């Protein structure tokens, strides 16, 4: 019922604002100059701005650790999620959190670089591409995704529902009770469809385009895990403990 789907959309948006200190609205204002971040565009400026490829990799890890905790808080506000079996809560987050991290990373990206440190820095795409192999290719798939994703012009209220749909995926490996998850997700999907019809009435087939982005995000994470297996066998540094736990037996 439509009015209830709007109240669900609003609950998720309000939850999102409580959970995520740097929203897309705030990031876009910083990125287009309407509020200045320190720009890191080479080795000299990286020094001014505070082995280089490994330092950068470790910085991305610590950001993910923070993001996992924000995302988990947000997941616990999705109606129904905290009443799932705890095993299933953990499986949903384990297999979902990177898909969300990369979705939200896009909010902080343009074609020329990415916001860091809650918008206090900006690291150029070219600088990241300049890092020694294999680290020069770490970010490039994420920027490629972001440019296409940002062209859909979603706002924070759209993203709140999209992220909830992704978390409530009933096809994750090892879920014990799929039916309650699919029932929550079906209601989230109806809420997403109505949100896009109301907020983007001029944007035909936006819903279908977003469903396809959910598949694309899975490919991003699969490719990232492939890059990690290269890194781990060519280098000799290890992951933050929370990331070790998430990646262990992550497809």
């Amino acid at each position: 019922e439509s009015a209830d789907l709007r109240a669900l959309a609003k609950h998720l948006y309000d939850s999102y604002i409580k959970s995520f200190p740097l929203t897309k609205a705030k990031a876009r204002a910083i990125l287009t100059g309407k509020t200045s971040p320190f720009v890191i565009y080479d080795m000299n400026s990286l020094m001014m701005g505070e082995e280089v490829a490994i330092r950068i990799f470790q910085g991305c890890q610590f950001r993910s650790v923070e993001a996992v905790q924000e995302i988990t808080e947000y997941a616990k506000s999705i109606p129904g999620f905290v009443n799932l079996d705890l095993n299933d809560q953990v499986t949903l987050l384990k297999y979902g959190v990177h898909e969300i991290i990369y979705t939200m990373l896009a909010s902080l990206m343009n074609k020329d670089g990415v916001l860091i440190s809650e918008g206090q820095g900006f690291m150029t795409r070219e600088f990241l591409k300049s890092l020694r192999k294999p680290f020069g290719d770490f970010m490039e798939p994420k920027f490629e995704f972001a440019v296409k994703f940002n062209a859909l012009e979603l706002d924070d209220s759209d993203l709140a529902i999209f992220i909830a749909v992704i978390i409530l995926s009933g096809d994750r490996p090892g879920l014990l009770n799929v039916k309650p998850i699919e029932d929550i997700q079906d209601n989230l999907l109806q809420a997403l469809e109505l949100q896009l019809k109301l907020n983007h009435p001029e944007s035909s087939q936006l819903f279908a385009k977003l469903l396809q982005k959910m598949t694309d995000l899975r490919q991003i994470v699969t490719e990232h895990v492939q890059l990690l297996q290269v890194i781990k066998k060519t280098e000799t540094m290890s992951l933050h403990p929370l990331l070790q736990e998430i990646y262990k037996d992550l497809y």
């Binding site: 996992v68 988990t72 616990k76 705890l86 095993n87 953990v90 987050l93 929370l242 736990e245």
Partner: peptide
Amino acid sequence: SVXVRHXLLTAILX
């Protein structure tokens, strides 16, 4: 189980 292999995620969820 899943719970036993994810001490930290469990703590955050709790």
